[PDB]
Design a protein around this ligand. Structure first.
Ligand code: SF4
Ligand code: SF4
Ligand code: SF4
Lengths: 97, 156, 143, 171, 299, 373, 176, 70
């Protein structure tokens, strides 16, 4: 709850900074007066590589176990599949401009 | 009396903070824009005074009109002028800008820039020397020094 | 490295003290004092050094209320007498105490400086007399 | 600021779900679902929770709402309210307040269950000598034990990539 | 005393970012032939202070709830993102903190997109959408490289990292991985050569430069530093601070020199040059401890 | 956004459909105003219709009036005019380099070469007195010749500037990312180079071995050793290379012009066209009459039309005079290389993207004052 | 006489191609660019401190548009209208009347400092050097009324300094 | 020269030096001089809870050394 106290203090002080930015000047003086496809490919590309990152990233917590051969095997299989997806969109001229 | 003392010191503080830096937007149509770039030179720094060249209109402190205003340019000129924060000051640089200049007796040339925006500093020359423009900006700072804004608010 | 630390101490101590060091620091910038060439009415001092490059030759230090405007701070141009204005713009090679003057009796000694934004400033008008000289009606009546 | 801090964060969690399931404009819905994901992360880290909750927070908040707001901003407009939206919010708020009423003022709440609504420190361990986590060696499986599962998972994701490019004009 | 810890963190962020702005402006000035600024006060300190004041007294004008909600998120990230940074004794001993770095960088991407939506249907918002796309194309690279540089460190706890950096620096077992990661720090800070891109401009500007100082402190902790000697941590604090300062000056110094990319050249360069090289260096870092029999002590 | 012009670009997403410059935002009336003045009065319009070149356009108009008038300028004035023409070519090329640098990014060499350009503005100030709009070039010779103590300063600048352009080629020019910015943008067919009327550094930079100094030497350029670089490919990295080499060849021409300065004469010895010097004015009678009527009425010109063109650093700077036999011109037009280069923007921007379109506009030396006439 | 460029091929010798490959995959000339920028970092800046150190100028600078008067005598002006005859902006306005003494003089002598393009033709066209371009540069006036100089403004302006202008003319009466 | 950029560097480095110094002094100042016991594992928290239990002061850092042997 200590970090909740930190989040609360930072949020409240930042809101006070925003209200100093807005409601400070008391001198109320004079009030006066299409999308593309290739944007969308980048987001889903990021999304699927992020999902395979989520699959990869608990690797170093796993490094203390006995079945080292299967670990190294499926780890190389995961990075290889990720690079195969990248090479697939690379050779099928997908993310090009 | 002591409230007058507080208002005087606070007004002097905020006017000092305004006259501290004053980054403009470099509007700059003709050869007076080249001389604005040459008062951005190493031999004459704007950056010694807090003056920064920045074409962001929504954070423009003052505005330097420099060049030859035309009839096709003027509506876009005031449309740029109105999307600016409310403390605003105008430096007319150049013989063309401060009264038409060499293209005065001509169509398609607005006779100066009094006919569009209010003007605060006139610095003449063709081009005004970077020396002279910087003297004009210092005189602008001293105009900001003499403003008594919050004193007039207090005796209002 | 120590000699650079050594030469900066002489700029502080040899200037006249920490009062005079902080004064000329907070005037604008100067710590390059050390020549002391000239001085003039309105009390201003004129320093020309040679060991710096072209442009840092000649610099002016003003006074406090040469007219009564609190010009300790907020110094300006046109606060220079004319012979020093030929001097400090690097148009010549002579400090103007060699021969300043001219033998003509019209020249000011106040040298009224820049004054836009004062109660005492220039106004334009016409240096021309009457144009068409309107007809004078007589004062006597006919009944 | 009491015992029921997990329960209060659960209440704000239900508030966020009602906030975007009251059918607002979809960028307001994305805002409310960001709120919901943050407070659900708070709930799971209250159960500790050290690894998996803040883990998939990256994938859920760090990977989904950005793409949803991306597509929502670029595709359609709804450029400048209606009684049906605020009425759904009224009904959700009223059912939430009714659940608060029947939890706090009674013994138990049964829709078709048996909920004992009290201090939910129960159930919890009596401070055993874990010395890593549960989540540590938990997700530090999948590699000495997970032969089949991560293989078919990565295979499904590779097929997902080729499906996406085909639909968005393979090749 | 804990709120006093919070105040001693987030009161020097204002002074830190403002003096960072004067430092970068003076440094760019001496990179060129400029003494900017030195006229306005003693060596230009009151000029950033009073200029921040003038920026707070600008009186601007104007969707309103969205315009509220974006910079508040940006600056609360800028506040809440110096928590586990282990200047010797960190604020919160998080069991994992690097994944928290990644999550709050994604929250900064939220901030940029909300500002772009609040910009009210402009060619600027199309450009801000492109900036959101380029900013989101980097957390892949940063997370994977960060994963590899913690792989030689066992745990996410970052105190284990300050243990690992005692013998030699970690810059020597992974220098090209570190090079790619530093280019990704240039990438995440959204500054030169990676550009482009209303108010409150002070708060948004504050958020960007506190993000810069965070990335430089995290760079300095991740790859090099000094030894944590207990019962005199200020020695480590001084040496860490000096190295982080030199790295941040180098960071602005690399910004002082090169023109900015083309957007499609930026994407082309990112994917087809960093991303296979990341995967190859990362699989080599996976197979490295099994071929040196040195897996770190995951406790 | 500063560059100032209107551009309407209709496009399919980030690529193209059709992009058209609406120019005419800056139109002043230079031709009509010269039609209502005399020649000597309306010389500064020629000084500032292009405003970066401050002596090349002077030289063009003075050669136009001499070509219409049949009066050879004296040789010492010709060598001084050559020296200032090459200084001005140097200044315009270095501005074009630095403004493309700051238009693309690349913040600092802008400032570096502007320090160099401040030194050359000091030279212009000492010579004429103007900062930038030094008229200084009458029809029929150079007015008010250069003071003592100038040539050695030019010599010192020449050495320092060779070193500084070497340091600019150290900074950029085999810089990786600027080259990666500019590889194959702005293809120009030689047929398109002819039919679209590109001139100067475009023609220097793509194909044709065409230079006005070496095809019609309008002055004593036939006596100095240099070579214009030819461009190999239709792109702007190569065109940048030919700009930088034209700068260095201008340095060579300045060195040879310092070595070949005759002590001849200032102006023409024709007191019906050039005004007499002030001492013989205030002594003699005929000199006073010629001063008086030469400044009231101006010199009469035989009638007819002429065209001439010289090397502005943008290209074929053409001035076309129509002179009824009178003291006033009857019409003048300025064939503008900037206008000609702006004409072919569809062919230079059909197959690229908009940031590269901004790079295309920046890599061609545009001012949009000379584009106006 | 020409020197065309981009004549090198990428050499297929293994030395040159591995040097370009190590250049690509080791980021070499980017560090060379940083070295050049640090070489300009540790120099000394060419910044004059402006309100004290004023910049260098020429003996022939064109400033104030002042007038002059004779040594121990009246105005050097004659009002023969040559400067209005040559003034390309037509900024000069002269209306001339003689006084009762018989010598020819003026009434009105106006310069549009707005319209003034600062050629120097009025300096180089007056037969007696009556109107002279001043040395200074500071006009810098807040109101559009006040940049329209009259004859008495110019007389109080040129009588603010003589020895400056006379020193420049004595330095510069031979080149022109 | 860059002698003048060094005060800005030094002042901003003081602004970077202060939060770590304040944090370290507050840990060594509000925990009896002993370093704050960093704890990541349930083993160490159980040990810390029995430590603060057996002290009687309801403070874990008092550490009650070698007195209850009899
Ligand atoms: S005043 Fe002179 S220098 Fe300025 S824009 Fe006009 S012509 Fe150009
Ligand atoms: S200033 Fe000279 S040219 Fe002008 S009217 Fe007077 S005497 Fe004639
Ligand atoms: S400098 Fe030119 S525009 Fe100015 S008053 Fe003299 S002749 Fe007229």
């Amino acid at each position: 709850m200590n970090l909740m106290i930190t989040l609360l203090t930072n949020f409240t002080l930042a809101t006070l900074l925003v209200t100093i930015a807005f409601w400070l000047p008391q001198l109320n003086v004079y009030s006066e007066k299409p999308f593309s496809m290739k944007f969308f490919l980048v987001a889903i590309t990021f999304l699927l590589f992020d999902l395979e990152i989520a699959l990869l990233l608990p690797l170093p917590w796993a490094s203390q176990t006995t079945n080292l051969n299967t670990m190294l095997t499926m780890a190389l299989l995961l990075i290889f599949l990720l690079a195969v997806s990248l090479a697939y969109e690379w050779t099928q001229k997908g993310l090009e401009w | 009396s002591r409230g007058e003392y507080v208002v005087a010191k606070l007004d002097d503080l905020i006017n000092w903070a305004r006259r501290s830096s004053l980054w403009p937007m470099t509007f700059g149509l003709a050869c007076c824009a080249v001389e604005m770039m040459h008062m951005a030179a190493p031999r004459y720094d704007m950056d010694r005074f807090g003056v920064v060249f920045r074409a962001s209109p929504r954070q423009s402190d003052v505005m330097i009109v420099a060049g030859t205003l035309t009839n096709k340019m003027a509506p876009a000129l005031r449309k740029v002028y109105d999307q600016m924060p409310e403390p605003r000051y105008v430096v007319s640089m150049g013989s063309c800008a401060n009264g038409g200049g060499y293209y005065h007796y001509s169509y398609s040339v607005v006779r100066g820039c009094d006919r569009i925006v209010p003007v605060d500093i006139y610095v003449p020359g063709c081009p005004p020397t970077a020396e002279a423009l910087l003297y004009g900006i210092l005189q602008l700072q001293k105009k900001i020094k003499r403003e008594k804004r919050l004193r007039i608010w207090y005796r209002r | 490295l120590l000699q650079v630390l050594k030469r900066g101490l002489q700029q502080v101590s040899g200037h006249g003290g920490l009062r005079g060091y902080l004064r000329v620091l907070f005037r604008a910038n100067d710590v390059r004092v050390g020549t002391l060439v000239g001085e003039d009415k309105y009390g201003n001092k004129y320093y020309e050094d040679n060991k710096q490059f072209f442009g840092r030759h000649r610099w002016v230090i003003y006074t406090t209320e040469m007219n009564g405007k609190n010009t300790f701070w907020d110094v300006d141009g046109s606060m220079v007498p004319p012979e020093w204005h030929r001097w400090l713009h690097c148009m010549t090679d002579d400090p103007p105490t060699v021969k300043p003057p001219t033998a003509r009796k019209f020249i000011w000694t106040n040298h009224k400086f820049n004054l836009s934004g004062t109660p005492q400033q220039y106004v334009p008008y016409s240096t021309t007399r009457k144009k068409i000289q309107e007809w004078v009606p007589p004062s006597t009546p006919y009944k | 600021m009491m015992t029921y801090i997990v329960f209060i964060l659960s209440i704000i969690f239900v508030m966020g779900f009602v906030g975007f399931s009251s059918k607002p404009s979809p960028i307001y819905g994305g805002l409310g679902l960001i709120v919901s994901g943050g407070v659900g992360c708070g709930i799971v880290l209250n159960f500790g929770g050290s690894f998996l909750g803040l883990m998939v927070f990256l994938i859920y908040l760090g990977g989904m709402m950005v793409v949803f707001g991306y597509t929502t901003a670029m595709a359609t407009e709804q450029y400048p309210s209606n009684k049906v939206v605020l009425g759904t919010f009224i009904t959700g708020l009223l059912m939430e307040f009714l659940m608060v009423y029947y939890v706090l003022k009674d013994k138990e709440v049964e829709i078709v269950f048996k909920f004992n609504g009290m201090g939910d420190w129960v159930i919890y361990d009596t401070g055993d000598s874990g010395f890593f986590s549960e989540e540590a060696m938990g997700i530090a499986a999948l590699y000495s034990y997970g032969t089949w599962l991560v293989i078919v998972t990565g295979w499904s994701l590779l097929i997902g990539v080729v499906v996406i490019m085909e639909i968005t004009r393979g090749n | 005393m804990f709120m006093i810890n919070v105040l001693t963190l987030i009161i020097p962020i204002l002074l830190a970012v403002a003096f960072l702005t004067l430092v970068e402006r003076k440094v760019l000035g001496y990179m060129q032939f400029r003494k900017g600024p030195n006229v306005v006060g003693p060596y230009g300190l009151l000029q950033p202070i009073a200029d921040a004041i003038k920026l707070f007294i600008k009186e601007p004008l104007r969707s309103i709830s969205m315009f509220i909600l974006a910079p508040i998120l940006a600056l609360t990230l800028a506040l809440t993102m110096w928590i586990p940074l282990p200047m010797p004794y960190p604020l919160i001993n998080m069991n994992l903190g690097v994944l928290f770095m990644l999550a709050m960088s994604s929250l900064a991407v939220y901030s940029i997109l909300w500002s772009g939506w609040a910009s009210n249907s402009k060619y600027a918002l199309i450009g801000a959408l492109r900036a959101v796309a380029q900013t989101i194309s980097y957390e892949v690279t940063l997370a994977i490289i960060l994963l590899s540089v913690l792989l030689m460190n066992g745990s996410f706890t970052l105190s284990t990292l300050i243990i690992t950096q005692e013998q030699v620096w970690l810059i020597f077992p992974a220098w090209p991985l570190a090079m790619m990661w530093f280019i990704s720090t240039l990438a995440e800070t959204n500054r030169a050569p990676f550009d482009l891109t209303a108010g409150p401009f002070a708060l948004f500007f504050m958020a960007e430069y506190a993000n810069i100082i965070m990335m430089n402190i995290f760079t300095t902790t991740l790859f090099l530093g000094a030894f944590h000697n207990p019962y005199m941590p200020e020695l480590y604090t001084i040496n860490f601070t000096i190295k982080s300062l030199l790295l941040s000056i180098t960071f602005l110094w690399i910004r002082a020199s090169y023109p900015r990319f083309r957007y499609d050249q930026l994407m082309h360069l990112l994917w087809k040059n960093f991303l296979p090289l990341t995967l190859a260096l990362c699989m080599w870092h996976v197979s490295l401890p099994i071929l040196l029999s040195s897996i770190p002590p995951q406790t | 956004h500063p560059a100032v012009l209107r551009l309407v670009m209709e496009l399919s997403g980030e690529m193209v459909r059709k992009c058209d410059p609406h120019i005419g935002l800056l139109h002043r009336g230079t031709e009509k105003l010269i039609e209502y003045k005399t020649y000597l009065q309306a010389l500064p319009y020629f000084d500032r219709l292009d405003y970066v070149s401050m002596m090349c356009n002077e030289q063009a108009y003075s050669l136009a009036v001499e070509k219409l008038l049949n009066i050879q300028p004296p040789p010492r004035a010709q060598w001084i005019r050559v020296l200032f023409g090459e200084i001005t070519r140097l200044l315009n090329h270095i501005m074009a380099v630095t403004t493309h640098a700051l238009d693309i990014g690349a913040m600092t060499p802008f400032f570096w070469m502007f320090e160099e350009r401040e030194k050359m503005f000091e030279f212009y100030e000492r010579v004429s007195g103007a900062r930038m709009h030094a008229a200084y070039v009458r029809p029929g010779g150079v007015h008010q010749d250069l003071p003592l103590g100038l040539m050695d300063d030019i010599y010192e600048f020449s050495k320092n500037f060779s070193l500084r352009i070497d340091e600019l080629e150290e900074m950029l020019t085999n810089n990786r990312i600027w080259r990666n910015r500019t590889v194959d943008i702005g293809v120009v067919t030689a047929e398109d180079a002819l039919n679209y009327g590109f001139s100067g550094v475009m023609l220097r930079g793509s194909g044709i071995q065409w230079d006005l100094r070496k095809t019609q030497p309008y002055d004593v350029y036939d006596q100095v050793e240099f070579d214009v670089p030819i461009g190999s490919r239709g792109d702007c990295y190569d065109r940048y290379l030919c700009r930088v080499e034209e700068m260095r060849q201008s340095i060579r021409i300045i060195s040879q012009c310092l070595n070949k300065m005759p002590p001849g004469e200032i102006k023409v010895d024709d007191a019906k066209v050039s005004p007499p010097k002030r001492a013989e004015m205030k002594t003699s009678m005929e000199s006073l009459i010629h001063h008086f009527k030469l400044y009231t009425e101006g010199y009469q010109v035989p009638p007819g039309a002429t065209y001439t063109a010289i090397e502005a650093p943008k290209g074929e700077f053409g001035v076309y005079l129509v002179s009824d036999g009178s003291s006033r011109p009857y019409r003048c037009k300025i064939k503008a290389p900037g206008f000609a280069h702006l004409a072919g923007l569809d062919k230079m921007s059909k197959g690229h993207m908009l940031a590269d379109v901004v790079a295309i506009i920046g890599t061609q030396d545009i001012v949009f004052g000379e584009v106006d006439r | 006489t020409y020197k065309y460029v981009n004549l090198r091929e990428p050499s297929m010798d293994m030395k040159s191609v591995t040097d370009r490959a190590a250049q690509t995959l080791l980021w070499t000339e980017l560090i060379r660019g940083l070295g050049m920028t640090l070489s300009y970092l540790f120099r000394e800046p060419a910044t004059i401190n402006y309100p004290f150190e004023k910049g260098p100028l020429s003996p022939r600078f064109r400033g104030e548009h002042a007038l002059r008067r004779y040594p121990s005598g009246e105005e050097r002006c004659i009002a023969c209208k040559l400067c209005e005859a040559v003034c390309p902006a037509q900024a000069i306005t002269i209306e001339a009347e003689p006084r009762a003494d018989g010598s020819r003089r003026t009434t009105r002598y106006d310069i549009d400092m707005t319209k003034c393009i600062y050629c120097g033709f009025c300096q180089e066209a007056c037969p007696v050097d009556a109107i002279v371009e001043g040395p200074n540069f500071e006009f810098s006036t807040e109101t559009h009324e006040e940049l329209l100089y009259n004859k008495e403004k110019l007389l109080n302006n040129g009588d603010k300094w003589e020895a400056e202008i006379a020193a420049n003319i004595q330095a510069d009466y031979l080149y022109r | 020269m860059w002698f003048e950029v060094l005060p800005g560097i030094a002042v901003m480095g003081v602004c970077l030096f202060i939060p770590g110094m304040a944090t370290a002094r507050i840990h060594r100042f509000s925990n009896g001089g002993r370093e704050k016991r960093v704890a990541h594992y349930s083993y160490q928290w159980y040990l810390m809870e029995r430590d603060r239990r057996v002290s009687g002061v309801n403070r874990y850092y008092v550490s009650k050394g070698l007195e209850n042997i009899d």
